[PDB]
Design an enzyme around this catalytic site. Structure first.
Site, PDB file in Angstrom:
ATOM      1  N   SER A 180       0.794  -1.225   0.000  1.00 28.30           N
ATOM      2  CA  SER A 180       0.000   0.000   0.000  1.00 28.30           C
ATOM      3  C   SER A 180       0.828   1.278   0.000  1.00 28.30           C
ATOM      4  O   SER A 180       0.246   2.361  -0.107  1.00 28.30           O
ATOM      5  CB  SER A 180      -0.944   0.014   1.196  1.00 28.30           C
ATOM      6  OG  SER A 180      -1.782  -1.114   1.151  1.00 28.30           O
ATOM      7  N   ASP A 206     -18.075  -0.299   0.633  1.00 33.66           N
ATOM      8  CA  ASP A 206     -17.031  -1.306   0.771  1.00 33.66           C
ATOM      9  C   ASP A 206     -17.562  -2.527   1.506  1.00 33.66           C
ATOM     10  O   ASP A 206     -17.514  -2.577   2.747  1.00 33.66           O
ATOM     11  CB  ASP A 206     -15.831  -0.730   1.517  1.00 33.66           C
ATOM     12  CG  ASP A 206     -14.700  -1.738   1.678  1.00 33.66           C
ATOM     13  OD1 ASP A 206     -14.762  -2.791   1.000  1.00 33.66           O
ATOM     14  OD2 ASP A 206     -13.776  -1.476   2.491  1.00 33.66           O
ATOM     15  N   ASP A 244     -11.037  -7.317   0.602  1.00 30.18           N
ATOM     16  CA  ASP A 244     -10.444  -6.221   1.361  1.00 30.18           C
ATOM     17  C   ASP A 244      -9.579  -6.824   2.467  1.00 30.18           C
ATOM     18  O   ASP A 244      -9.749  -7.988   2.857  1.00 30.18           O
ATOM     19  CB  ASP A 244     -11.536  -5.308   1.965  1.00 30.18           C
ATOM     20  CG  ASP A 244     -11.087  -3.802   2.140  1.00 30.18           C
ATOM     21  OD1 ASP A 244      -9.882  -3.510   2.083  1.00 30.18           O
ATOM     22  OD2 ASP A 244     -11.930  -2.906   2.347  1.00 30.18           O
ATOM     23  N   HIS A 277     -14.957  -1.362   5.185  1.00 30.15           N
ATOM     24  CA  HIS A 277     -14.728  -0.073   5.826  1.00 30.15           C
ATOM     25  C   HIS A 277     -15.908   0.883   5.657  1.00 30.15           C
ATOM     26  O   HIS A 277     -15.739   2.091   5.861  1.00 30.15           O
ATOM     27  CB  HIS A 277     -13.484   0.590   5.257  1.00 30.15           C
ATOM     28  CG  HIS A 277     -12.302  -0.313   5.151  1.00 30.15           C
ATOM     29  ND1 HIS A 277     -11.229  -0.269   6.019  1.00 30.15           N
ATOM     30  CD2 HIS A 277     -12.022  -1.275   4.254  1.00 30.15           C
ATOM     31  CE1 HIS A 277     -10.341  -1.176   5.651  1.00 30.15           C
ATOM     32  NE2 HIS A 277     -10.794  -1.786   4.567  1.00 30.15           N
ATOM     33  N   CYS A 317      -7.689   1.106   2.391  1.00 27.30           N
ATOM     34  CA  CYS A 317      -8.663   0.167   1.846  1.00 27.30           C
ATOM     35  C   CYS A 317      -8.098  -0.469   0.580  1.00 27.30           C
ATOM     36  O   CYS A 317      -7.432   0.190  -0.222  1.00 27.30           O
ATOM     37  CB  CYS A 317     -10.030   0.811   1.543  1.00 27.30           C
ATOM     38  SG  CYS A 317     -11.460  -0.385   1.737  1.00 27.30           S
TER      39      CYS A 317
END
Lengths: 516, 509
Positions: free
Chosen positions: A248, A272, A287, A293, A306
């Site tokens: 990420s 989500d 996820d 989320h 996310c």
């Protein structure tokens, strides 16, 4: 017309802190114009100077090529025993001389080994490429010493004063290098610090290091094998050669491409459910938080990392556009650093797959890439550059190590960003994305009260040694950035751990500013 | 799932002046040998248009159909079922001759040689960039396809060149009817403001396929309108080279601004009978650097070269762009040659002779430079040594991401004062006052040179310069092929300087 070889130039840090040197040693020369037939002479003095079978092979190679008047080294930097055992027979070898020469010294060897490299003995392959290197015993083999071999080398003379090699001032900071090194002391990984205004590398540590001085005069097969067969691989340059899945750490840049291609807004939100499924496909892409989320605009995506927000964004964007844009931050391509063996990384595309695996690109392979997984790998150098560009609002920089050279030879030194990423957004977007990245630190704990750090964390999976890697990218002071850091703690588990390594580096540079 | 091809992007100058676009046309898509004879009177196919179509063998029979052949074919639509009538785009150059050597043209994609290296990206795409900007930026310009549920294609990126339409017109006029090149760079950035090679040609003849009559006119014209004298042509740069080379004397500590020599009108290699000749056989007397520049003494640079040595001579001159491509974003950029012993040993298997150094010392050796290289070297000289990359693209607008370089590459470390650059500027201003290009409105620095060829046997005239000298905004290199003495070439440069620096806040089309 005896050749007078030229002094290799000194290398300093950005402060004059001396990092590479020349000091005198005793060396046994042997010119052709002083000896009748070399091959016999060498055989007699092999047991007296303890020449290895490589030392004779090397000496013969130079002699065949060398001029009459030029003295060729039989053994370099003689130990006191080679000095003693030859002095007893000193006169029984008349042509053989033994006088003072220079070798290379690295006062802070482990510290800068993976940036400065070392010089070696000049050898066969190198010998097939002048009369420039006449009196010259050593050539740069890796690192700065290789990449700037010609600047450093100097210009010979005869019996005409030789021109001394150029001094190099690196953009590295002795202090910042020390701090970062301690952070990775006992640990495997890398820490790269770039000045985003310039692309100057302020600190570059790959860890474990090694002692370069062991290489300068030729290294023991015993000592060399210990380094090559160490399981932590001290000889491997994790900052410029090592490649990792970024995870990420890439999301901030990839979000900016959403804004750039118009796929999203700062206010655009998604529901989500904890997964994303490709249209007309049952396989759920999950996820990291399986519940999800909730509703996620861009700013929650970055703060909370996310995956689902970026599964969708990648899906709409497509690997082709995803390639075109992420590449603007330095991915998938060498960064241009003035250091020898720089790795490309891999930002995958159907062209790479058709040649590598002769399979058509699958729409789902995109989804893996959007979160920094799959075939996507970046060098720590690349990740730092991507963070520098993101900090500087899109001004493309070249990571470089050299700040100035002083000397006779002319050279051009790069000290500003080359160009600016065309970006269909406001400047405001860069500023909003910074504020998101300030929140990554606040909303989740390496905070400082003295300045603001923007950052994003990541975690990669290994190809104890099985523990996930921790990655962290960031920059400070966030509003007007001066330094961006990429850290990759191998087997460091949580990324936030990697952030902890990055804070002392920041603190030193921005707050704290010699001998060993 | 039929492909929808993407609209090529527009090309403008730095001011929005449209320089290339696409306009919609009607074209007839598609045994074929029988039908074409029937379809020839209807579509007004020439014997060349049929030959192309048979060789080419949906394949186009005729492009840009007139309204009449569309009407006349519509009454007979039923006798030809396979023959369809579709919409396509072609490329148009509003100012074809003017920007031909910068933009180039798009050709037909027919080239299987190119039609095998690329993708399904060019699905439904009839045209590809062939030379110049259109080639070098084909991918930025191309766009991204779509299909048929239908997906809109993403159109190519618009390009804004750093070139200025007005400044290009002015410069083009200066070489109207004459052979040579003129390049104008912004020294602060490396942006190419103007680039004319002369004679030019009309690119639009290439878009649709070019007639053997028209193409033979261009390929067998004696003036070579298809040759790009700015980016491909190389010339002996001659005494234009001296300001830079003198700066290298300062850098190597070999000379001072006060260092003076006796010029007997020749130079004698130590222990050698062959005299090396000044252009003025009388000599120039006592010559420090500043006299050297004004009067273009060969002798002063004969001495400096010998002391400097060809190897040291290479290191320095290459910092100005010589002997290697400049990096321009245009296709076929020529390297030039700054000669070195490495080149001679590899090319002619001969050791370098100290006299060969002397020829190069005044830009008359195997030394050759492109007008690009000369413009760049002069930009750096005006600029006190910040290496710029000559480039033509100023911005692109569009969906595709692109990075645009618009600042200097790096800075030549120079073991001199900053003032040495300022002293050399003052010398080059003195070249203008003392030796008719002068203006009282701003200050021009310049230097003149002359190259020897192999009317058309006259020596070429060269001129490099920049203005306003104190705060440079534009540097120009001019080459009149067969322009006799340089200074004629300088005359071409003054209108250009003036348009940029004076007129251009009062030339639109």
């Amino acid at each position: 017309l005896q050749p007078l070889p030229p002094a290799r130039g000194y290398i300093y840090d950005r402060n004059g802190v001396l990092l590479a040197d020349n000091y005198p040693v005793f060396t046994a020369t042997l010119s052709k114009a002083d000896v009748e037939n070399v091959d016999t002479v060498i055989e007699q003095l092999q047991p007296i100077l303890e020449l290895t079978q490589e030392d004779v092979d090397r000496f013969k190679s130079r002699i065949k090529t060398a001029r009459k008047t030029e003295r060729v080294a039989i053994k370099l930097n003689l130990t006191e025993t080679n000095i003693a055992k030859f002095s007893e027979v000193k006169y029984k070898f008349p042509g053989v001389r033994i006088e003072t020469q220079m070798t290379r010294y690295y006062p802070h060897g482990d510290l800068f080994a993976h940036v400065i490299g070392y010089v070696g003995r000049i050898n066969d392959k190198e010998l097939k490429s002048k009369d420039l290197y006449a009196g010259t015993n050593l050539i740069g083999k890796i690192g700065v010493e290789k990449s700037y071999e010609d600047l450093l080398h100097g210009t010979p003379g005869y019996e005409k004063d030789p021109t001394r090699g150029n001094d190099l001032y690196l953009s590295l900071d002795y202090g910042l290098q020390v701090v970062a090194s301690q952070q990775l002391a006992g640990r495997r990984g890398a820490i790269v610090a770039i000045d985003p205004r310039t692309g100057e590398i302020l600190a570059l540590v790959s860890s474990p290091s090694f002692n370069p001085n062991l290489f300068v005069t030729g290294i023991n097969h015993k000592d060399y094998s210990s380094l090559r067969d160490n399981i932590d691989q001290p000889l491997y340059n994790r900052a410029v050669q090592g490649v990792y899945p970024p995870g990420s750490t890439i999301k901030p840049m990839e979000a900016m491409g959403g804004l750039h291609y118009g796929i999203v807004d700062w206010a655009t939100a998604i529901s989500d459910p904890g997964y994303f499924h490709l249209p007309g496909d049952s396989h759920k892409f999950r996820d990291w938080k399986k519940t999800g989320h909730g509703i996620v605009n861009m700013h929650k995506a970055i703060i909370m990392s996310c995956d689902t927000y970026f599964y969708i964004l990648a899906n709409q964007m497509g690997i082709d556009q995803m390639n075109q844009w992420m590449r603007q931050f330095g991915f998938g391509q060498k960064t241009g650093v003035d250091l020898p063996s720089e790795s490309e990384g891999l930002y995958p595309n159907p062209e790479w797959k058709m040649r590598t695996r002769k399979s058509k690109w699958m729409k789902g392979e995109t989804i893996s890439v959007s979160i920094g997984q799959g075939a996507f790998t970046a060098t720590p150098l690349q990740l730092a550059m991507a963070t520098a560009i993101t900090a500087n609002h899109g001004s493309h920089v070249v990571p470089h190590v050299l700040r100035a050279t002083h000397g006779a030879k002319p050279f051009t030194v790069r000290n500003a960003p080359d160009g600016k990423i065309n970006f269909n957004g406001t400047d405001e977007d860069w500023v909003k994305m910074r504020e998101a990245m300030i929140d990554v630190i606040q909303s989740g704990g390496i905070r400082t009260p003295l300045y603001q750090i923007a950052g994003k964390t990541g975690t990669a999976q290994v190809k104890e040694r099985q523990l996930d890697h921790g990655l962290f990218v960031g920059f400070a002071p966030a509003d007007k950035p001066e330094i961006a850091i990429a850290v990759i703690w191998e087997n460091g588990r949580h990324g936030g751990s990697a952030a902890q390594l990055a804070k002392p580096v920041f603190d030193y540079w921005l707050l704290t500013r010699i001998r060993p």
